[PDB]
C-alpha cells in the first residue's frame, strides 16, 4: 500500500524543525551560483540524522 | 544610562536590607533598621519612576509611604521597649519561648 517509512518520515518532521529551518536558510543563502561550489550537505545531514533517529524505533513495529 | 544607575542605587539599598536581615540573627534592632532600609529603597523606586514616566502618582504614594514608615517605626520601637522592659535584656534567647 503506502510505505510505512515514508509516512513516518513525514510524521517525525515536528521533532526536527530546528535542523529543517537551518537547512531551509542555507538553501536561500546559496541560491546564487558563485561558480557552483556552495552547498548545504552539512545541514542536509543534520536534518536527516534527526529524522532517522526519530523513525528508527517505531518503523520495525509496522513491519512483519 | 541614568535610569539604570538610579535604579541600581535603590536596588543596592534593598539588597543591603536583605543582607542585614540575614547577618544579624542576634541583633533584632538592626533587623528593624534593615526593614527601614528596604522601605527607603522602595520610596526611591517610586520617585525615580515618577520622574522617568512624567507621572505624579509615584510622588503621591512616596509621601504616603513616608507616613506609613514613620508609624511602623514608632510602633516597632514601642514593642521593643516593652519586650526589653519585661525581660531586662534584648538577647534573642529570651524571646524564643513560643515554639512548636
Amino acid at each position: 500500500v503506502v510505505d510505512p517509512k515514508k509516512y513516518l518520515e513525514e510524521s517525525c518532521k515536528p521533532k526536527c524543525v530546528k535542523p529543517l529551518l537551518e537547512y531551509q536558510a542555507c538553501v536561500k543563502r546559496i541560491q546564487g551560483d558563485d561558480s557552483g561550489h556552495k552547498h548545504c550537505t552539512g545541514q542536509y545531514f543534520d536534518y536527516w540524522q534527526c529524522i532517522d533517529k526519530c523513525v528508527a524505533p517505531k518503523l520495525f513495529a509496522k513491519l512483519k | 544610562m541614568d535610569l539604570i544607575k538610579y535604579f541600581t542605587f535603590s536596588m543596592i539599598i534593598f539588597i543591603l536590607g536583605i543582607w542585614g536581615i540575614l547577618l544579624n540573627r542576634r541583633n533584632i534592632l538592626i533587623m528593624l533598621m534593615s526593614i527601614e532600609l528596604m522601605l527607603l529603597a522602595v520610596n526611591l523606586n517610586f520617585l525615580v519612576f515618577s520622574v522617568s514616566l512624567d507621572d505624579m502618582m509615584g510622588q503621591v504614594f512616596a509621601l504616603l509611604v513616608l507616613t506609613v514608615a514613620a508609624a511602623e517605626s514608632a510602633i516597632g520601637l514601642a514593642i521593643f521597649v516593652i519586650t526589653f522592659r519585661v525581660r531586662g535584656t534584648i538577647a534573642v534567647e529570651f524571646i524564643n519561648s513560643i515554639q512548636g
Binding site: - | L53, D54, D55, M56
Partner: protein
C-alpha cells in the same frame, strides 16, 4: 503615565498614547486589535526601540572605524 498628571504641572508625556490605547480597547473585543497602540504607549514609557535603533547606528559607526 496613565493618570494624566505631569510632574511639571502639564499633561503627561505619555497620556495621549495611553488614552488612544484605552479608547481602542473599550470597543475592540480582541486585544490584538489594539497591539500597535499598546506598544506605542510602552515605547513612550521606556524608549526601548528608539534607543535600540540608535545603538545600532553607534555600533555600525564603531564597526566602520
Amino acid at each position: 503615565m496613565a493618570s494624566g498628571w505631569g510632574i511639571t504641572g502639564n499633561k503627561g508625556r505619555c497620556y495621549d498614547f495611553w488614552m488612544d490605547f484605552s479608547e481602542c480597547m473599550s470597543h475592540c473585543r480582541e486585544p490584538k486589535d489594539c497591539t500597535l497602540l499598546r506598544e506605542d504607549y510602552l515605547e513612550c514609557l521606556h524608549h526601548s526601540k528608539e534607543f535600540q535603533r540608535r545603538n545600532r547606528i553607534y555600533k555600525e559607526e564603531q564597526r566602520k572605524l
